Design a protein around this ligand. Structure first.
Ligand SMILES: C[C@@H](NC(=O)CCc1nc2ccccc2c(=O)[nH]1)c1ccccn1
Length: 354
């Protein structure tokens, strides 16, 4: 007997978001942008076991990069058997530098989040038996177990967020704000409330691939075993929207380029400042709660405002970037804000920008 499809409860903007973040075209586009062979590795065929085998192959490469073992070419060839790549049907290249190794780790971390979104969409047994089903976009929203509330122009934080975006975004071609959603991923709540005594909270940008937005909404910002970067194995944020915007992978839809950016509330507590890259970091030094790789510039602190979120004061920058003379010789042009415990961040807002 034919099941009733119930009318969609979602507003137009939210329907478009949910469409975009679970879009099979988007996911395949992302795989093509990462040089993967989508014909050999279709979305439905992606598995946790394959991804795990891919990480094992990179682990062997990393050991080799650091005695009569297999060549980097041999070890590369195994990686490429496990995770099919497309380079117009020429041979893929050997993974023979730290930079390329980390780039392959980052690719697999994105691919793991694509696989998460596919696994999330698997049809449950209850769903095969019920005689009515939600509209597919309601079903997809529900799978996130994440409350999203579209804000309008006159929500209390709206202008504050717009100002953060405009003032710290690129001077030329600032991203154009289309929508803001408030994000409430419950049971981020419990673990976040752990740091309730920890002051020094700031609202910070986190930009990402469109392909990982569903995973983040479902699971929060995460630190994975193979996460890395210029400040080690943590969660990376920026106070300058233009820095985070560099990591936004958007997608052409009609005549525009659509992308998504988060704002997280980050309990930074006692800050350890650095001025040179350190990819080996796994925690702040003792008695520090965060590591800030300080940039040549910082949003003018004299213009900071505050928002009250769950009864706590949260700093929100509102100023254009100004020079910080103490960090004029830093290896970082713009600051990178690092935490090394997932519990120190709560997602607060999601922005659609064109
Ligand atoms: C590959 C990793 N993505 C990021 O951390 C990407 C974006 C990011 N990097 C920054 C670095 C410095 C300052 C800001 C940012 C940021 O906003 N985004 C990732 C993707 C999926 C699952 C787990 N980790």
């Amino acid at each position: 007997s034919m099941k009733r499809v119930q009318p969609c409860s979602l507003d137009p903007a939210t329907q478009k978001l949910i469409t975009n973040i679970f879009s099979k075209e988007m996911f395949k586009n992302t795989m093509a942008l990462m040089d993967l062979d989508v014909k050999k590795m279709p979305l439905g065929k992606l598995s946790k076991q394959q991804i795990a085998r891919g990480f094992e192959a990179l682990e062997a490469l990393e050991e080799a990069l650091k005695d009569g073992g297999q060549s980097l070419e041999e070890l590369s060839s195994h990686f490429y058997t496990v995770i099919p790549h497309n380079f117009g049907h020429s041979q893929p290249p050997p993974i023979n530098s730290p930079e390329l190794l980390q780039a392959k780790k980052d690719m697999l971390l994105v691919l793991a989040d694509i696989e998460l979104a596919q696994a999330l969409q698997a049809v449950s047994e209850q769903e095969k038996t019920v005689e009515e089903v939600p509209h597919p976009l309601d079903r997809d929203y529900q799978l996130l177990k994440c409350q999203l509330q579209l804000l309008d122009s006159g929500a209390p934080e709206y202008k504050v967020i717009q100002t953060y975006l405009e003032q710290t975004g690129s001077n030329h071609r600032c991203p154009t704000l289309q929508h803001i959603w408030k994000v409430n991923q419950e049971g981020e709540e419990d673990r976040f409330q752990a740091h309730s005594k920890l002051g020094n909270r700031k609202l910070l940008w986190h930009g990402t691939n469109m392909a990982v937005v569903a995973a983040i909404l479902t699971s929060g910002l995460r630190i994975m075993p193979h996460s890395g970067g210029r400040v080690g194995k943590g969660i990376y944020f920026a106070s300058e929207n233009s820095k985070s915007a560099g990591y936004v992978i958007g997608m052409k839809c009609g005549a525009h380029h659509v992308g998504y950016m988060f704002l997280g509330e980050v309990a930074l507590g006692r800050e350890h400042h650095i001025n040179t890259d350190n990819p080996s970091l796994k925690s702040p030094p003792p008695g520090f709660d965060s590591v800030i790789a300080r940039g040549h510039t910082e949003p003018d602190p004299t213009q900071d405002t505050e928002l009250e979120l769950d009864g706590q004061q949260v700093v929100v920058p509102q100023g254009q970037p100004v020079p910080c003379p103490e960090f004029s010789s830093s290896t970082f042009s713009q600051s990178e804000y690092l935490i090394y415990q997932e519990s120190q961040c709560r997602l607060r807002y999601l922005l659609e920008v064109h």
